[PDB]
Design a protein around this nucleic acid. Sequence first.
RNA 1: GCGGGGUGGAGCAGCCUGGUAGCUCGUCGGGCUCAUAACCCGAAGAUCGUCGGUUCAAAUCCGGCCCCCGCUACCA
Lengths: 129, 409, 80
Amino acid sequence: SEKEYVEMLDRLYSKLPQSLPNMIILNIGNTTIIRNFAEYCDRIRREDKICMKYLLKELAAPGNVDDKGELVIQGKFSSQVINTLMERFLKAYVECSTCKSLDTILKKEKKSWYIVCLACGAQTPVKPL
Amino acid sequence: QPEVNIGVVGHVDHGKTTLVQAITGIWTSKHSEELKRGMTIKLGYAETNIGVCESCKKPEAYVTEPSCKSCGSDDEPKFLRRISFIDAPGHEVLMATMLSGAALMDGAILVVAANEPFPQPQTREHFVALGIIGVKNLIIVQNKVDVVSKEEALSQYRQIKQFTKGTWAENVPIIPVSALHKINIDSLIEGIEEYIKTPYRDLSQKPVMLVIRSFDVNKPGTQFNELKGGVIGGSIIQGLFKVDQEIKVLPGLRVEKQGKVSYEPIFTKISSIRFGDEEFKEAKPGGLVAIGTYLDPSLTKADNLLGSIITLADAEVPVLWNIRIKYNLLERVVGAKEMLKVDPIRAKETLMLSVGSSTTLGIVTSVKKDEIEVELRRPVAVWSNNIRTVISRQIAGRWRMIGWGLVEI
Amino acid sequence: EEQKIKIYVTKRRFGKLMTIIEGFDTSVIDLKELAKKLKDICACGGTVKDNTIELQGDHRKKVAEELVKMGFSRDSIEIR
RNA sequence: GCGGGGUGGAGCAGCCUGGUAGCUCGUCGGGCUCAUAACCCGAAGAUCGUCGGUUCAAAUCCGGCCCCCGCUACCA
Ligand SMILES: Nc1nc2c(ncn2[C@@H]2O[C@H](COP(=O)(O)OP(=O)(O)NP(=O)(O)O)[C@@H](O)[C@H]2O)c(=O)[nH]1
Ligand SMILES: [Mg+2]
């Protein structure tokens, strides 16, 4: 009986270790808006409130999300700094330490959150915030 | 509390502990700092919950946390059982512990390395130990396929499918994995959810259990007002223990009288019962437990009562010094890089007698066809008539598994 | 593990040249018992001198081979 | 981030108390002995980690990196 197995070998191989959509940003008075903040987060398996909370906290500015997944930052910030703070977000909350996949989950327990790689399988413990 | 005891045998550094880490998450610490530069040295320990995605497709349906929304969708996967592992070491010399460990297993998984010459010394040594003791519920696993040619891992699967022939291993399936990137593990959970079934155990039986660790919980500095009791780690096999029972440990501590030797049974009360990190009021076979006691933690610091057993206080068990083994030999020494043919037993020879979890040394007084009589340094409490044992010899400085049999009373 | 060792000739009394063995971890290895065992292998006098063993005569190969027999790594031992 | 240490071939002194580099593994010469050892005397060998600073003078005192070692003792 090889079929069952050969199958198994297939299925693991297809689990090994997707550029990132360019995050569209604009300005309207004194707001900076990330047209696809929703899609973006969506394609990194991360909750909007989270990228929002982080990204906002770092910005030291207020804001919430469109009913149509858009980020309205109550402050007019330069397209650039947004990315700089955004990658930093990726580094600390999405990228696997073991192999750097970016193909991860984000556990949570009493007070310990963990990054969980869908490729390598390892768990980078992160500072719940 | 965990249902069953699955062992992870295999050669050294093939990643046994690592596979345990992809399945549970847990590491075996690798501790004593020494293990941290070396490798697993005590039996590692870890537990996990296996539920299944009814509401979708397998093997992936084989879950780990009450969460199906990982594959297909949501319907909180149904819980099948909670299992436990026993990570042995892999080093040619930790043989004496791994043996010991098997005594607790209800089944196993042979981790071969995909990028090293198939029958590697210890891989075999283990395998035959398995077919010898009785652990017949086996799953071979091809580990490091994340570092090989798509040809290589299949040709190894060949040499495996060919070894697994004449031997007792019909359809012992072989599930190639990647313990490093945790790939394909779910089909492993499906194997181990099929083949390593959870044995029934009559509870009514005599409460009997094996010990393989023991610790002094107490932190460097805890005051005497809250010195937490002595703590005995091991696995139950038959019966069931409950909080507040009266218990004894065998053969138990030996006295000293001017060069004399004399072991004797230790009594105490089960102060407490714990599996993993969660406390329970009772405890039943499959798993390792830990038993809080009321005895001076000096008595079980480093792992003193290693190879000791715990039973019902006021129970009938022999503390032998001399034992009747019936027995058989391998024709080869599968465990040296060299396969030199097993010399028959000469009397007045020192041999390691591995009985239960314990590891004792003893000298041969009688040499018949398959019944030798052995004199022991440290007593063996023989709980049954069914006492499996494993017999070894110091071949070239390092000890080696050479044959087996059955204790006889 | 990681226990290296040096075995070489060391000036002595009557005979020709003693044999010096050093490099053992004295907190784990009892040199007194090791020396007694080595003295039986070489059938010569000897003592533990500080953290070394000194044997009378030239028994470098004998000692090295016995140490391997006793479980010490072949690759941890150097005869000079 | 703390603090210990780089000295003839190996392993250790000498440095806060600046000018004298000492000790053990074999070599060479001369003694002792009838002779071998042992013992004795006389000999070979060191840019003292490096880039500089203070001084009459720096192994030694003050800073700059380069490798070396340890840090308050480990979890049912
Ligand atoms: N590339 C790759 N490396 C792996 C894989 N599995 C384990 N390793 C590596 O193998 C090393 C050995 O891990 P370890 O689990 O200690 O091996 P072990 O077999 O458990 N040691 P012991 O035999 O004593 O229990 C680890 O450093 C790990 O990185 C694998 O599937 N792929
Ligand atoms: Mg290990």
